[PDB]
Amino acid sequence: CTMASTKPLSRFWEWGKNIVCVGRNYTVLSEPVLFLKPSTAYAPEGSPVLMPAYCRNLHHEVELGVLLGKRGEAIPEAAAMDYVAGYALCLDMTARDVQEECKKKGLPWTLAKSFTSSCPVSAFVPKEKIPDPHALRLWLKVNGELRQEGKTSSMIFSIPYIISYVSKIITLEEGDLILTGTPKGVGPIKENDEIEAGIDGVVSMRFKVKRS
């Protein structure tokens, strides 16, 4: 089978190897902060967000995800958008107190950012549906109440810039995903809370928060 019974972009979470996330993109450094999630962070719509046992302060971060359509090694910024298959709406689910400890102790962010279900993900949005990734409204509601809204025009580092920089450090494979940061309004969730989030005019998704 030489088809999309092999690498279907509509199911990128099933076969995608790597997830790369930018830090503060809405002190900021000369470059975007980068951290990884494992493939097993993916929570496709229908999956709950799982509060880890060790987690006291679970935070939502609505983020635009950029899906790579082809292998990219030191991708030029001017070519970067030729490497994009499309987008997903994502949550960068964060154990915020663990993260405070990680920052303070100079440890890796893995227990804060990389747990099971730490990357809820919408249906695949083909590139065609988004003329301009930097002209979108991201929104997130908890129990029907708006908590984050932000414009992707507010991004400090552009998506072509991010793809380029990341690919110079980490070769990206077909189906790798880059989370491009969260606007203002990040905040906590508790067991049995309902998250709704969307990109205006493009896609919405629902997640319930549960425990292990």
Cite the annotated binding site for oxalate by residue number: 24, 113
Return the one option of Cl ion, a second copy, Mg ion, none that residue 92 interacts with (CB less than 5 to 8 A, by type): Mg ion
Contact residue for a second copy among 171, 187, 196, 210 (CB under 8 A): 171
Find the binding residues for a second copy in span 175-194 (CB under 8 A).
176
Question: How many Å apart are CA 106 and CA 113, to the nearest integer?
Answer: 15
- By rule CB under 8 A, what string of x and - marks binding of each residue 6-25 to a second copy? -----------xx-x--x--
> Applying CB under 5 A, which residues contact Cl ion?
35, 55-57, 95, 97-98, 108-109
Annotated binding site for Mg(2+): 61, 63, 92
Q: Does 18 contact Mg ion by CB under 5 A?
A: yes
Q: Does 17 contact Mg ion by CB under 5 A?
A: yes
Residue type, position 43, single letter = A
- The answer to whether the CB of 195 falls within 8 A of the CB of 207 is yes
For residue 180, how many C-alpha atoms fall within 13 Å in the half-sphere facing its CB? 26
Going by their DSSP bridges, the two strands 49-51 and 203-211 should be labelled as parallel
Helices and strands, counts by H and E, the chain: 4, 16
Phi/psi at 10 (5° precision): -60, -15
CB of 39 to Mg ion, least distance (A): 5
Site size for a second copy (CB under 8 A): 41
Residue type, position 170, single letter = I
Return the one option of Mg ion, a second copy, Cl ion, none that residue 141 interacts with (CB less than 5 to 8 A, by type): none
SS3 159: helix
